[PDB]
Every structure is written in structure tokens, then in C-alpha cells.
Design an enzyme around this catalytic site. Structure first.
Site, mmCIF file in Angstrom:
data_model
loop_
_atom_site.group_PDB
_atom_site.id
_atom_site.type_symbol
_atom_site.label_atom_id
_atom_site.label_comp_id
_atom_site.label_asym_id
_atom_site.label_seq_id
_atom_site.Cartn_x
_atom_site.Cartn_y
_atom_site.Cartn_z
ATOM 1 N N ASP A 1 -6.823 147.058 76.489
ATOM 2 C CA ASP A 1 -5.396 147.148 76.321
ATOM 3 C C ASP A 1 -4.744 148.232 77.177
ATOM 4 O O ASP A 1 -4.709 149.394 76.801
ATOM 5 C CB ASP A 1 -5.054 147.350 74.839
ATOM 6 C CG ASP A 1 -3.564 147.345 74.593
ATOM 7 O OD1 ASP A 1 -2.837 146.982 75.540
ATOM 8 O OD2 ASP A 1 -3.117 147.839 73.531
ATOM 9 N N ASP B 1 1.294 145.186 79.200
ATOM 10 C CA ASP B 1 0.550 145.248 77.934
ATOM 11 C C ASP B 1 -0.395 144.072 77.736
ATOM 12 O O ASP B 1 0.024 142.986 77.372
ATOM 13 C CB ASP B 1 1.526 145.340 76.770
ATOM 14 C CG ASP B 1 0.852 145.647 75.468
ATOM 15 O OD1 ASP B 1 0.245 144.708 74.905
ATOM 16 O OD2 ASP B 1 0.964 146.801 75.001
#
Ligand SMILES: O=C(O[C@H]1CCSc2ccc(Br)cc21)[C@H]1C[C@]2(CN1)C(=O)Nc1ccccc12
Ligand SMILES: [Zn+2]
Ligand SMILES: [Zn+2]
Length: 394
Positions: free
Chosen positions: A224, A34
């Protein structure tokens, strides 16, 4: 880097995760990769959606930091107890790091049924670490404690009772040349918190959306890996969908399709890709008034999902959706591209991924330079709250 190729797995739409061990003796966990956050946090008590979890008391190398941590996202929240322990990535560099670990003790809408991951590796910068920016993130420790160069790169690759398995590569400490073709192009990191970038133009099948470019980065634009969709600020989303609707208008889909909440299907092998336009985001170049484009196909933004009922059809979910926290270049975008997180030079690289899904007529593309005289400022400045303003940073 041959030993880090294909070190990611997961299920379509539910995250790419890498194997890690925490503790002595080592406890293996599957950890979400992440770049939209900066904490290393792992499940640490039983949960309906977790096969297993970190057992602090079983690690002879654990140290309790005696301090609590809480992180709510727009969707998903967890809390837990801070500590440190020995951490390694079996299919990563041959090192062990003592890192901060948040041991998650409660959560909501965080873990995903069937996803097969049990924690999260926040690879963004200390400034968005919780509870504050003094909690050293994992990658910072890796680089501080080892010889590993301050850089990683991600190749995310796309793909009846279960969702499709996906695969990827997180190359820790550099750039594997087998993972891309053609030119690598860099866009500057606007600021080191998220991996924040600036979009200066958007085209849908070559047609300029002709919006004020600040709209594209309202209130930021970030890369992301831990978000599935290309998410776009309300205004950009609406214009974008109106354009993709217009190109695809030979097919009349339900509202729920464009809301990303319903599948649409064609007979196996007959999907009319050609009626869906390509989307090009132009990113700020390293050189003033330069930009380059990244061009994604409907293959990236139309996400495959097998129907139990019509398992004879190819069915797809719309994987562009609306945002209230800015543009998010998620796994949709990233799956086109080998993406280089060059923290050392404060930049992000894109090249066409050797594993991107395409067809006989179109490919995902990374192309530049494109030039603009008197390029305005497309960055937005987020309003500073008194909370934020009041924090000291010693
Ligand atoms: O983008 C991300 O967090 C942002 C979201 C905007 S609010 C916010 C506030 C503080 C911090 Br620190 C980050 C963020 C991470 C976390 C993520 C996907 N990537 C998510 O949002 N929910 C969720 C749910 C499960 C896994 C990953 C995720
Ligand atoms: Zn002070
Ligand atoms: Zn600070």
C-alpha cells in the site's frame, strides 16, 4: 515513459500524489496514489484543509449516477456522490478516460493539513470498490477504454518549517529500466482485492524471528503506497521491536519513539546507522517452495523530520508500527524498491530502486531464490461474515 518520471510529489509521511484533471473544461487536482483501495474520489466541497475541490456543475461532461458512496477506513472516512466524467493524467499516458468519480461531500480524518492533495486514486481491484464491486475502478476503465497495458509501477523516493518534499514516479502501462538496478523478482498476488501477498519469513539483521509464518500474514499482507509505515500485526511488531531495541541498545530512547510518536536526534551528520539492523521480508516466489528477500535499511524505517528547535540536529521518527488489519508494506518498504504492479500476470515485482537512500556499508536488497522443502501455507483465511456471504455477484 520519460514523461512519467518524477510525476509524483508530496510531503514526507503525508502521501504521494499525482496531478490529474477531471471535467470539461479540465479542473486540475492533486490526487493521492493509493494501492490500498479501489475508488477514485475527490474533494467536492470546501474544507479547511483543501485549497480547491472538484466543482461538478462546472464540467460539461459530468454525469450524475444518482447514487451515494461511503468508505470508512480504520483511520479516515469520506462520503459523496457517484458520477462519471472525463479524466486525464497530464504527466501520464496521452489518453482521456471516462471513469467513475466519487465527489466527496463530507469527510473525517481523511484530508491532511499541508499534504497538498485533494483526493485519492484507488488502484486496487474491483472487489474492494465501494459501494460494491460493480463500481468500475479507474485503472480498469483506463485499460478497457485505451491501449494501455494492464500494469503500472511505482518508484517512491525518500528524501525547517515544513516537512521535506518527496518525489516519485508512477509509470502507467509498463516498466522503466532506468528506475531500478539488478534483478526484478516477482511474488504472486494471492487474490485480486488488495494487492495481497504472502510473507514466508522475517529476519532482523539475519536473525530469524522464528514465528509461525501465518503470523506474518495475519490477517493479510498487502502493498500500500497510501500507508507511510511498515505496519505489522501485533505479535510480529512486538517481536520485531524487541529485536531492533536489542541491536540499538547503546541508545536508550523514550517509549514514545518506539510508538512512532516522538523524534530522536543526533548532531548533524553523526547518526549511528550501524547500530540499527536491516529487516528482511521473504516473499513467496512464483515457483513452489521458492522465495526471495527484500532487505530494507534503517534509512527507510527511520524517517527524517527536521526539528524547528534543534534544526542543527538530524532527527528521525520510528516508521514501523502496529496493525490490527495485517501487514502493510507502506512507503517505508516501497521507498527501497521499484515496485511493479503486474495485474496482467497477477504478480508484484521488486527490484532495488535507483533512488533508494543508503550508505557506504549497506544497501536495500532484493535477493533470491531461497528454497524451502515442504514450505507450509503461510496464508491466513479471513473469517467469512454473513454480510459478506449474503452478497450476490452477478
Ligand atoms: O489501506 C487503505 O485502506 C484500507 C485500510 C484498512 S480499513 C479499509 C477499509 C476499506 C477499504 Br476500500 C480500505 C481500507 C487505504 C486508505 C488509507 C491508506 N490506504 C487508509 O487506510 N486511511 C486513509 C486516510 C487517508 C488516505 C488514505 C488512507
Ligand atoms: Zn442474485
Ligand atoms: Zn462480484
Amino acid at each position: 515513459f520519460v514523461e512519467m518520471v518524477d510525476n509524483l510529489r508530496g510531503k514526507s509521511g503525508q502521501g504521494y500524489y499525482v496531478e490529474m484533471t477531471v471535467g470539461s473544461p479540465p479542473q486540475t487536482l492533486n490526487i493521492l496514489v493509493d494501492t490500498g483501495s479501489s475508488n477514485f474520489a475527490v474533494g467536492a466541497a470546501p474544507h479547511p484543509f483543501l485549497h480547491r475541490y472538484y466543482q461538478r456543475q462546472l464540467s460539461s461532461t459530468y454525469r450524475d449516477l444518482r447514487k451515494g458512496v461511503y468508505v470508512p477506513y480504520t483511520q479516515g472516512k469520506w462520503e459523496g456522490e457517484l458520477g462519471t466524467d472525463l479524466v486525464s493524467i497530464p504527466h501520464g499516458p496521452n489518453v482521456t478516460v471516462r471513469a467513475n468519480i466519487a465527489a466527496i461531500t463530507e469527510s473525517d480524518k481523511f484530508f491532511i493539513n499541508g499534504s497538498n492533495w485533494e483526493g485519492i486514486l484507488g488502484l486496487a481491484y474491483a472487489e474492494i470498490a465501494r459501494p460494491d464491486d460493480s463500481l468500475e475502478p479507474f485503472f480498469d476503465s483506463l485499460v478497457k477504454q485505451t491501449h494501455v497495458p494492464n500494469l503500472f509501477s511505482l518508484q517512491l523516493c525518500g528524501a525547517s518549517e515544513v516537512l521535506a518534499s518527496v518525489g516519485g514516479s508512477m509509470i502507467i502501462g509498463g516498466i522503466d529500466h532506468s528506475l531500478y538496478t539488478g534483478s526484478l523478482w516477482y511474488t504472486p498476488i494471492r487474490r485480486e482485492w488488495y494487492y495481497e501477498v504472502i510473507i514466508v519469513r522475517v529476519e532482523i539483521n539475519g536473525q530469524d524471528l522464528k514465528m509461525d509464518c501465518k503470523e506474518y500474514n495475519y490477517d493479510k499482507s498487502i502493498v500500500d503506497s497510501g500507508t507511510t509505515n511498515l505496519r505489522l500485526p501485533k505479535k510480529v511488531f512486538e517481536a520485531a521491536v524487541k529485536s531492533i531495541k536489542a541491536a540499538s541498545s547503546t541508545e536508550k530512547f523514550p517509549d514514545g519513539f518506539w510508538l512512532g510518536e516522538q523524534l530522536v536526534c543526533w548532531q548533524a551528520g553523526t547518526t549511528p546507522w550501524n547500530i540499527f539492523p536491516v529487516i528482511s521480508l521473504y516473499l513467496m516466489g512464483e515457483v513452489t517452495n521458492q522465495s526471495f528477500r527484500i532487505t530494507i535499511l534503517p534509512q527507510q524505517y527511520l524517517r527524517p523530520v527536521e526539528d524547528v528547535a534543534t534544526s542543527q540536529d538530524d532527527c528521525y521518527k520510528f516508521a514501523i508500527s502496529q496493525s490490527s488489519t495485517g501487514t502493510v508494506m507502506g512507503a517505508v518498504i516501497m521507498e527501497g524498491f521499484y515496485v511493479v504492479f503486474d495485474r496482467a500476470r497477477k504478480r508484484i515485482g521488486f527490484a532495488v530502486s535507483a533512488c533508494h537512500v543508503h550508505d557506504e556499508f549497506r544497501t536495500a536488497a532484493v535477493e533470491g531464490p531461497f528454497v524451502t522443502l515442504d514450505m507450509e501455507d503461510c496464508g491466513y483465511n479471513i473469517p467469512q461474515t454473513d454480510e459478506s456471504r449474503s452478497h450476490h455477484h452477478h
